[PDB]
């Protein structure tokens, strides 16, 4: 149900789990 946006510079990942 969330997301989490990881970033460096402009590169990110959202990873979304419950």
Not at 8 to 13: A, F, H, P, V
Request: one cysteine or more.
């Amino acid at each position: 149900g969330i997301c989490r946006c990881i970033c460096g510079r402009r590169i990110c990942r959202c990873i979304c789990g419950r």
